[PDB]
Design a protein around this nucleic acid. Structure first.
Ligand SMILES: [Zn+2]
Lengths: 211, 72, 44, 36, 60, 72, 101, 22, 102, 213, 60, 224
RNA sequence: AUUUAAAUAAUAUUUUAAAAUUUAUUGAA
RNA sequence: CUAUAUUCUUUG
């Protein structure tokens, strides 16, 4: 009698989806809740696990934070391009970077002004070290499927340079080992691997050939 | 009747005890408790009445954390 | 792969619809609600 | 060199006579309560 | 009694010097002495054992 | 057979030969059914190793009238 | 599943690049809490996994095009050695894994 | 075959059929 | 057709409730929704990815949607995503710290 | 089928034969059963041994761009054998490595690669840390911390238990008295209605006067 | 013990089999001059833990 | 026999795979063999030399090979250099007092066959390390003077140089950060640290249930 | 691990008898 | 005998 009950539950589901009774967060009861904020909408969206497996992007271990701030309105003609690159980068790589790095905290903000210059703030595990603030510099010969990877490369090399600039790493190392888990708010839909935790964690296991 | 006197100091040490007819009588609403030798501690401790068939170390058998006056 | 159990089949279905309709899994489709700013910044 | 005179392990013992299935088992023997 | 050649050996027995074993009149009616009266003495309950075993004593 | 709560996949079983009676026949390449066998001699092991496939068609293949492609 | 280690040579079906995929040790479901329905089908699928992933839809991710898809084609190593040994060394760089000169 | 005969003690040779052919 | 019986009737009546909800006003809306958001995808997103992924405006549509799988109530894979964190297995019957048996 | 019904239908026996069976078996169940012959354990699978300038020529017919690591060891089901040096002999696993052994003995340099052992991220060494006794010691430790907690204030408690026992004994002991005296005076009255004049001595309460009741 | 004595009747010079097989009684079956070419089961085999299989070993 | 209870589900003296049951080699037998003229005092005495000199019969040999027992011997006059398995403490001190040598070799079965029949193998071939319980008790034991003691005190007892405390046992650390990298694993570790009370080692998960198998068990108590 | 022997080979085990059983054919109603 | 009792103690 499983099939018809199944049907029942599906029609029921679509009904509540038309009438706005449906809670999309129920599998997520045990997780802490991300920032409800004008840029952080990349957090509340349920991420497929597959495209998180697709974008595997690691930065230097000595990075504790990545902030992406962008203006809501862009007065400038080229302002829109910069905002779009910033928006796309904030939506594509922010959550994955957080997911794989797990000590890095990532936050994007939509700040409301007409300003054409979005910026990215990188913090290292040193409290005494100033954060590095990278500008978004779209070249007017580069479209929005290319420039975003350029910004990604810039962020990676920025984090790397920020991490190799660190006063003695002993401290940074123990602070890293003891820094709590930053990727807890991420909501992942495990699709076709949900059955036991070990393939929930399946992105951690890496095959090393020819040692 | 057959009951188990199990250590109040929770070592899970139980001793089979047969109730006297007074204690067999339902006259009172209490569990029997008696000072006996606990070999697991090698000391004298209170034993409490508890059911013989059941886990003698249950989770609910944990004492809450008590800070001791002694030391700093 | 011929599923011999129903949950095996919903696994099969899920990887299938991850393959054939992949436009579902691009980030713009995840973001249908934001092609613009947040929904509370609008008009009536 | 001074190596201590006796090992002291808080570990419990694994066997007693009044317990039916207890005792240390061969690695490929069937375990306790197998095939329930 | 478990000697040291047993399969299981137990821990130290209770030291005899503490918490002795009282010589109690046997409560079994066939083993009870005849003249022993059932001890009804109407008394205010003295809850500490220190005084309550003084009542069982005549030292004056 | 692992008692650990989390078991990420390993190249070779990390704890040595897998314990338990079932893992014996698993490592032998036999089915889990073998824990229920009393006769463990050569012939029974050969019988349940499954290399020989014992099953038949209802009619001889020349005379087979239905498409049984593999169903014996 | 799975008791033993095994190496496979798979072809990415979109871009036709050959990468290798390994299957390692995962333990049997507990014999003490016993389930016949788990153990037995696990056995049959184990035999299946051992033979060329016959009834399994292969799902992995391309390295040369990074996406997760099940287009993969499992190659027995003679078909691999037929595919590999007829190649120019510059297309070994594109189609195959690092080195493998 | 409620009970199996002891066939392991015989070497393999065909006995003559008792209603022997003329 | 028993009505005087309470839960035998009002539950199958609940059933016909549910399944006269669908094929009149529910199903055309679901189908129209599925049509409308692909229609949304192909003139807004797709013109970007045709440029991005390196295809034409046409063959990118055959690539991003290789097949049409529209969802009808007897075909659906899952109602909701499987739980992120699954609760922790205690020992057998509330034993502490551990149990010898299973 | 009679094989299911367990009939011994052997032809030397009754002349019959089992109907669903193959009429030819090139190797019967016993010599299928012996896996030592079939598998390669402890057994040489290549029976000819080549001189140096033979081995060098055999290695010379291998196409460049070939690794040994591309030739997986066949399973137990597959027979272990080597056809010697034939064309495409390097595709044969056992031939490859047997040749490798002759090349190790003869002091011939081995042009090909060597077999790689792929390993995971989570792998452990061979001498591996023990989980069993670490478990037993830590959970035991937990039990004795619990014991340390539970034993706080034990002696006073065990002092009050004895007082509660003595009280519970004493109260019912003294209630029993008032029960039994009203019982026995009721029986005194019920002996006094039947006119039995009971003396003072044969009464157990020997100062009792019945006229006062 | 009588059930253990029935392997050789009229061999009076023998001694009965023990409960658990001793090391001589394990080695006696590989130490004959009929087993000396069998490098299986020599010096005891089946009582040792098995050889680590080739890292690619599989029975299918 | 049914009036008698069962004990220790395998049986009291039970063999299992990997029980170390040694055949005895009495030190008196050895010294008799040396002073008689079977064996070189000049030479490291292996199990091979014992088999070849005929002092021990083929039947006696089984895995694991032998134990050196001092039976009726209160001293060893000359120095002896000997390699055997699992000698008793008194035999070892009796050898060492003379100025002799003992090395407790411990071999997997293949090792036995390769030492007893050296002629069969022309090249030195890769030999297995003996299994885990035997590595704990014999090969890496300074008291028995096993042969892996240097290897333990040089290579084995140190973790990976990068490794954190939790990942210490792993050959290579699976992740970079020592902190548990999964929110589920983290929840589980929290529950573990409140399950067991907060002891130092509680960070690493140890499973609540056991094997009761002989291949993981080590010495309960005894002289160090 | 305080602490003494030894001729290392097995293959066998009365006898005649039910009412019965099982397998495969033939025949009768 | 099988289950419940898993420390020196305990059920049918
Ligand atoms: Zn590809």
């Amino acid at each position: 009698s499983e099939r018809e009950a199944a049907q029942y539950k599906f029609i029921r589901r679509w009904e509540l989806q038309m009438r706005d009774e449906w809670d999309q967060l129920e599998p997520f009861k045990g997780l802490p809740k991300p920032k409800r904020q004008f840029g952080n909408e990349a957090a509340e969206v349920i991420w497929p696990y597959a495209l998180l497996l697709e974008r595997v992007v690691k930065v230097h271990p000595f990075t504790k934070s990545i902030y992406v701030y962008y203006a809501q309105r862009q007065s400038t003609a080229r302002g829109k391009l910069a905002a779009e690159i910033a928006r796309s980068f904030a939506r594509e790589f922010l959550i994955p970077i957080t997911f794989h790095n797990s000590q890095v905290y990532t936050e994007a903000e939509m700040l409301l002004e007409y300003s054409e210059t979005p910026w990215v703030v990188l913090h290292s595990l040193d409290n005494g070290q100033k954060p590095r603030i990278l500008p978004v510099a779209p070249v007017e010969g580069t479209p929005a499927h290319t420039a975003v990877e350029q910004l990604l490369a810039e962020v990676v090399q920025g984090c790397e340079a920020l991490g190799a600039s660190v006063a003695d790493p002993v401290t940074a190392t123990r602070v890293l080992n003891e820094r709590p888990l930053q990727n807890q708010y991420v909501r992942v839909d495990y699709q076709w691997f949900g059955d036991t935790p070990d393939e929930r964690a399946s992105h951690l296991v890496r095959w090393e050939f020819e040692p | 009747n057959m009951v188990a006197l199990r250590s109040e100091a929770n070592t899970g040490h139980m001793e089979g005890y047969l109730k006297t007819e007074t204690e067999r009588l339902d006259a009172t609403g209490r569990k029997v408790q008696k000072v006996l030798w606990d070999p697991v501690l090698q000391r004298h401790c209170l034993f409490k009445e508890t059911k013989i068939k059941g886990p003698f170390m249950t989770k609910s058998a944990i004492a809450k954390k008590v800070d001791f006056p002694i030391g700093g | 792969e011929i599923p011999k159990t129903p949950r095996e089949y919903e696994k099969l279905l899920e990887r299938q619809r991850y393959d054939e309709e992949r436009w579902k899994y691009t980030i713009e489709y995840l973001f249908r609600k934001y092609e613009d700013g947040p929904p509370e910044l609008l008009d009536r | 060199a001074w190596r201590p005179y006796q090992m002291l392990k808080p570990m419990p013992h694994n066997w007693g006579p009044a317990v039916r299935s207890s005792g240390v088992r061969g690695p490929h023997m069937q375990l306790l309560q197998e095939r329930i | 009694v478990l000697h040291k050649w047993a399969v299981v050996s137990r821990s130290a027995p209770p030291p005899r010097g503490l918490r002795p074993i009282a010589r109690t009149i046997p409560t079994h009616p066939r083993l009870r002495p005849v003249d022993y009266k059932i001890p009804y003495v109407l008394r205010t309950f003295i809850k500490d054992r220190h005084t309550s075993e003084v009542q069982h004593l005549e030292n004056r | 057979f692992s008692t650990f709560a989390l078991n990420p996949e390993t190249s070779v079983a990390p704890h040595g030969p897998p314990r338990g009676l079932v893992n014996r026949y698993v490592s032998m390449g036999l089915p889990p059914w073998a824990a229920w066998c009393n006769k463990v001699n050569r012939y029974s092991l050969y019988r349940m190793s499954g290399v020989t496939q014992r099953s038949f068609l209802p009619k001889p293949p020349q005379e087979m009238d239905v498409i049984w492609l593999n169903e014996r | 599943s799975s008791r033993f280690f095994q190496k496979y040579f798979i072809r990415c079906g979109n871009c036709q690049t050959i990468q290798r995929y390994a299957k390692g040790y995962k333990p049997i479901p507990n014999p003490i809490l016993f389930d016949s329905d788990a153990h037995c089908r696990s056995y049959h699928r184990e035999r299946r996994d051992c033979t060329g992933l016959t009834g399994t839809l292969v799902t992995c991710r391309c390295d040369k095009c990074a996406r997760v898809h099940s287009h993969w084609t499992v190659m027995d190593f003679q078909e691999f050695l037929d595919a590999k040994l007829v190649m120019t060394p510059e297309e070994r760089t594109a189609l195959l894994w690092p080195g493998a000169g | 075959i409620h009970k199996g005969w002891r066939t392991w003690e015989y070497q393999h040779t065909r006995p003559d059929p008792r209603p022997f052919p003329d | 057709e028993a009505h005087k019986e309470s839960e035998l009737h009002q539950n199958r009546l609940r059933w016909v409730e549910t399944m006269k909800w669908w094929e009149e006003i529910g199903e055309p809306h679901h189908q129209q929704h599925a049509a409308s958001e692909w229609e949304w995808f192909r003139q807004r997103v797709l013109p970007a990815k045709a440029a991005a992924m390196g295809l034409s405006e046409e063959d990118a549509a055959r690539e991003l949607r290789r097949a049409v799988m529209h969802e009808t109530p007897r075909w659906y894979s899952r109602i909701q995503p499987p739980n992120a964190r699954s609760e922790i297995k205690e020992p057998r019957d509330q034993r502490w710290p551990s149990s010898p048996k299973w | 089928t009679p094989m299911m019904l367990n009939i011994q239908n052997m032809m030397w026996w009754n002349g019959k034969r089992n109907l669903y069976r193959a009429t030819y078996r090139e190797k019967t169940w016993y010599e299928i059963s012996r896996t030592g012959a079939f598998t390669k354990g402890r057994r040489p699978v290549m029976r000819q041994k080549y001189s140096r300038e033979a081995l060098q020529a055999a290695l010379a017919m291998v196409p460049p761009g070939f690794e040994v690591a591309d030739v997986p060891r066949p399973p137990q089901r597959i027979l272990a054998q080597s056809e010697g040096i034939v064309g495409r002999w390097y595709s044969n696993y056992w031939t490859l490595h047997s040749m490798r052994y002759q090349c190790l003995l003869a002091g011939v340099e081995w042009p090909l690669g060597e077999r790689q052992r792929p390993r995971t991220n989570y792998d452990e060494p061979f001498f591996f840390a023990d989980f069993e006794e670490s478990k037993a010691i830590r959970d035991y430790r937990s039990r004795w911390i619990n014991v340390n907690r539970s034993l706080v204030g034990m002696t006073k408690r065990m002092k009050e238990a004895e007082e509660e026992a003595r009280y519970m004994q004493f109260r019912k002991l003294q209630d029993t008295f008032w029960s039994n005296r009203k019982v026995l005076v009721n029986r005194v009255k019920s002996m006094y209605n039947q006119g039995a004049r009971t003396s003072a001595k044969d009464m157990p309460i020997k100062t009792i006067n019945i006229k006062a009741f | 013990m009588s059930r253990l004595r029935i392997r050789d009747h009229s061999n009076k010079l023998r001694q009965p089999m023990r409960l658990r097989a001793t090391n001589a009684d394990i080695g006696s079956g590989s130490s004959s001059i009929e087993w000396e070419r069998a490098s299986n089961r020599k010096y005891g085999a089946m009582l040792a833990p098995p050889k680590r299989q080739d890292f690619e070993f599989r029975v299918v | 026999f049914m009036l008698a209870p069962r004990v220790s589900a395998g049986g009291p003296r039970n063999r299992y795979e990997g029980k170390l049951v040694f055949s005895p080699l009495r030190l008196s037998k050895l010294l008799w063999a040396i002073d008689t003229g079977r064996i070189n005092p000049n030479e490291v005495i292996t199990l091979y030399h014992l088999r070849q000199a005929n002092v021990v019969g083929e039947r006696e040999i089984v895995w694991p090979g032998f134990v050196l027992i001092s039976n009726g011997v209160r001293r060893v006059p000359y120095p002896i250099h000997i390699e055997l398995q699992n000698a008793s403490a008194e035999s070892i001190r009796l050898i060492e007092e003379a100025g002799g040598s003992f090395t407790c070799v411990y071999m997997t079965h293949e090792g036995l066959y390769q030492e007893l029949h050296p002629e069969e193998y022309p090249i030195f071939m890769d030999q297995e390390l003996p299994e885990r319980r035997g590595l704990e008790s014999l090969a890496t034991n300074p008291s028995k003077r096993g042969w892996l003691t240097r290897w333990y005190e040089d290579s084995s007892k140190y973790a990976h140089p990068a490794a954190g405390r939790r990942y210490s046992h792993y050959l290579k650390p699976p992740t970079e950060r020592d902190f548990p990298a999964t929110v589920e694993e983290y929840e589980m570790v929290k529950h573990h640290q409140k399950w067991h009370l907060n002891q130092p080692g509680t960070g690493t998960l140890l499973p609540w249930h056991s094997y009761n198998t002989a291949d993981l068990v080590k010495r309960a108590a005894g002289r160090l």
